[PDB]
Amino acid sequence: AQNPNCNIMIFHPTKEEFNDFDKYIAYMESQGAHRAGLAKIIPPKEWKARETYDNISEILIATPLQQVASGRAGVFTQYHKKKKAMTVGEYRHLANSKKYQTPPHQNFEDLERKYWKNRIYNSPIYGADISGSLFDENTKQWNLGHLGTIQDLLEKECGVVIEGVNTPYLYFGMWKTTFAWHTEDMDLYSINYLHLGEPKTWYVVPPEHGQRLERLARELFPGSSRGCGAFLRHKVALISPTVLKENGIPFNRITQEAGEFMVTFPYGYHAGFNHGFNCAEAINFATPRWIDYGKMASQCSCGEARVTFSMDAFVRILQPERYDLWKRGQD
Numbered sequence: 001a002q003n004p005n006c007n008i009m010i011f012h013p014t015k016e017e018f019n020d021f022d023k024y025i026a027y028m029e030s031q032g033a034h035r036a037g038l039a040k041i042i043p044p045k046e047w048k049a050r051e052t053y054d055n056i057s058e059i060l061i062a063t064p065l066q067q068v069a070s071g072r073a074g075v076f077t078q079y080h081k082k083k084k085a086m087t088v089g090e091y092r093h094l095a096n097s098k099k100y101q102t103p104p105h106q107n108f109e110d111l112e113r114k115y116w117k118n119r120i121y122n123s124p125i126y127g128a129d130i131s132g133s134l135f136d137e138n139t140k141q142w143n144l145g146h147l148g149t150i151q152d153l154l155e156k157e158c159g160v161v162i163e164g165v166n167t168p169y170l171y172f173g174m175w176k177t178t179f180a181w182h183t184e185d186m187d188l189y190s191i192n193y194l195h196l197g198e199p200k201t202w203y204v205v206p207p208e209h210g211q212r213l214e215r216l217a218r219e220l221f222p223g224s225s226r227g228c229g230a231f232l233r234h235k236v237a238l239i240s241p242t243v244l245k246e247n248g249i250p251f252n253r254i255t256q257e258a259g260e261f262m263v264t265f266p267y268g269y270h271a272g273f274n275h276g277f278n279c280a281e282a283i284n285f286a287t288p289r290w291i292d293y294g295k296m297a298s299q300c301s302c303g304e305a306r307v308t309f310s311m312d313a314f315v316r317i318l319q320p321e322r323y324d325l326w327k328r329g330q331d
């Protein structure tokens with residue numbers, strides 16, 4: 001078996017290997033990359049996502065979210081408080097202000113220490129989940145707005161045509177902005193490109209060990225667990241690497257820099273934080289190997305997780321027994 005310790009693998013495709021997305025994901029998995037739950041892909045030196053980022057300041061962040069933490073430094077939840085709309089220009093200026101900017105630090109490790117020590121005492125503002133794309137329409141390779149759709153993948157594998165569309169989302173981050181522990185909707189893959197700015201640190205649990213994370217989460221967030229059998233779908237819980245080590249949960253960590261792709265694999269729990277002002281783009285995708293994960297994915301039916309239009313059909317076709325109860329949570 002390839003990659004039996006489930007280490008995060010880093011790939012360096014040639015421009016020739018960068019032509020066929022599906023085939024390169026399949027290549028990564030042949031080398032065991034999926035076992036880690038996350039892989040990094042450094043694009044060929046000839047590749048660019050677009051010419052410059054000089055003209056992005058007028059993008060609107062309609063609902064910036066202030067991420068308010070509760071709990072202890074290592075074990076906390078966050079809620080999202082809606083703020084007034086601002087432009088990317090305005091957000092960048094905010095991220096760089098004395099109140100929000102990245103503190104002096106030595107290296108990524110010092111910064112990680114400071115994150116876990118101090119995150120809960122601040123409430124950074126995240127421009128998340130903005131529909132759109134920063135890829136130039138003439139970028140032909142690994143353009144996240146031109147990937148094959150999950151609906152077409154399900155049709156090709158299962159023979160059923162379904163409604164729904166699949167488009168990318170932009171994330172504008174600042175120091176301490178945080179993504180809680182989660183897998184993707186319907187345990188899909190995701191791909192994330194860091195277009196610009198400061199790095200993003202990621203933590204991931206191997207898919208074969210996801211249930212161990214879930215069990216620890218039920219113990220650490222006992223009221224949440226009683227409220228919903230899949231409460232990590234709410235995307236609110238944070239557990240530090242120190243806490244995971246103390247409880248023997250296998251995980252890995254890696255820092256993504258501007259110009260690099262990250263791929264998360266089905267049922268790979270991940271969490272992380274931004275180092276400073278940045279902009280990432282991400283999208284979910286499927287392969288034939290996803291189908292069996294989709295059929296087994298947990299679902300939130302307490303009503304909190306509230307998800308896209310397109311998830312209906314996935315639940316309807318792949319999880320017909322769950323469909324009724326899940327849709328009652330959606331309505």
Ligand SMILES: O=C(O)CNC(=O)C(=O)O
Binds near residue numbers: 178270
């Ligand atoms: O970039 C972020 O804030 C979070 N991204 C992801 O969880 C992802 O791409 O799967």
Ligand SMILES: [Mg+2]
Binds near residue numbers: 056057058
């Ligand atoms: Mg603009």
Ligand code: NI
Binds near residue numbers: 264
């Ligand atoms: Ni994710």
Ligand SMILES: [Zn+2]
Binds near residue numbers: 304
């Ligand atoms: Zn729920």
